[PDB]
Write a protein that binds this ligand. Structure first.
Ligand SMILES: OC[C@H]1O[C@H](O)[C@@H](O)[C@@H](O)[C@@H]1O
Ligand SMILES: [Ca+2]
Length: 128
C-alpha cells in the first residue's frame, strides 16, 4: 500500500533491509529511497514513520563526503541543515555513509552504517 503526498507515492516497508538492498527494492518498483525537499515532506515522512527508523535516500557522493540524494535531487546543505538530529551527521566509527529518519521531529535524520538493516521508504512520482 503506497501513501500519497503532494504528487508522489511513498512505500513504508514492512521488512528491514540494508540501505542498498532497500534501494534495489525501490528501483524494482520504479522508485527510489525517498528524498526530502521541504518541511512539509519531512513532516509527512516523520509523522508517518510513527517513531520507527526508516532508511531514506541520503548517501555520500564525491571525495569530500558530501551528502546527496540517490534520486538525484540536488542536495541543499543550507536548506537541509534543520532536518538532522542535533549532533548529526557525526560519522561514527568513520563508517556512516547513509542516512535514515530516526527521531519523530523535524530534526529527524541520523547518519548510520550502510550495512545496518532498517525499514525503508520508497518514493515514486505520479505521472498524470
Ligand atoms: O548518539 C548518537 C549515535 O548513536 C549511535 O551510536 C548511532 O545511531 C549513531 O549513528 C548516532 O550518531
Ligand atoms: Ca550518526
Amino acid at each position: 500500500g503506497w501513501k500519497y503526498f503532494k504528487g508522489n507515492f511513498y512505500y513504508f516497508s514492512l521488512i528491514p533491509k540494508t540501505w542498498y538492498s532497500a534501494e534495489q527494492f525501490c528501483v524494482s518498483r520504479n522508485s527510489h529511497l525517498t528524498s526530502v525537499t521541504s518541511e512539509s515532506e519531512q513532516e509527512f515522512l516523520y509523522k508517518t514513520a510513527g517513531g520507527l527508523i526508516y532508511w531514506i535516500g541520503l548517501t555520500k557522493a564525491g571525495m569530500e563526503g558530501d551528502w546527496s540524494w540517490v534520486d538525484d535531487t540536488p542536495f541543499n546543505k543550507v536548506q537541509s541543515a534543520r532536518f538532522w538530529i542535533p549532533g548529526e551527521p557525526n560519522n561514527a566509527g568513520n563508517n556512516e555513509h547513509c542516512g535514515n529518519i530516526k527521531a519523530p521531529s523535524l530534526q529527524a535524520w541520523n547518519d548510520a552504517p550502510c550495512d545496518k538493516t532498517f525499514l525503508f521508504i520508497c518514493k515514486r512520482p505520479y505521472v498524470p
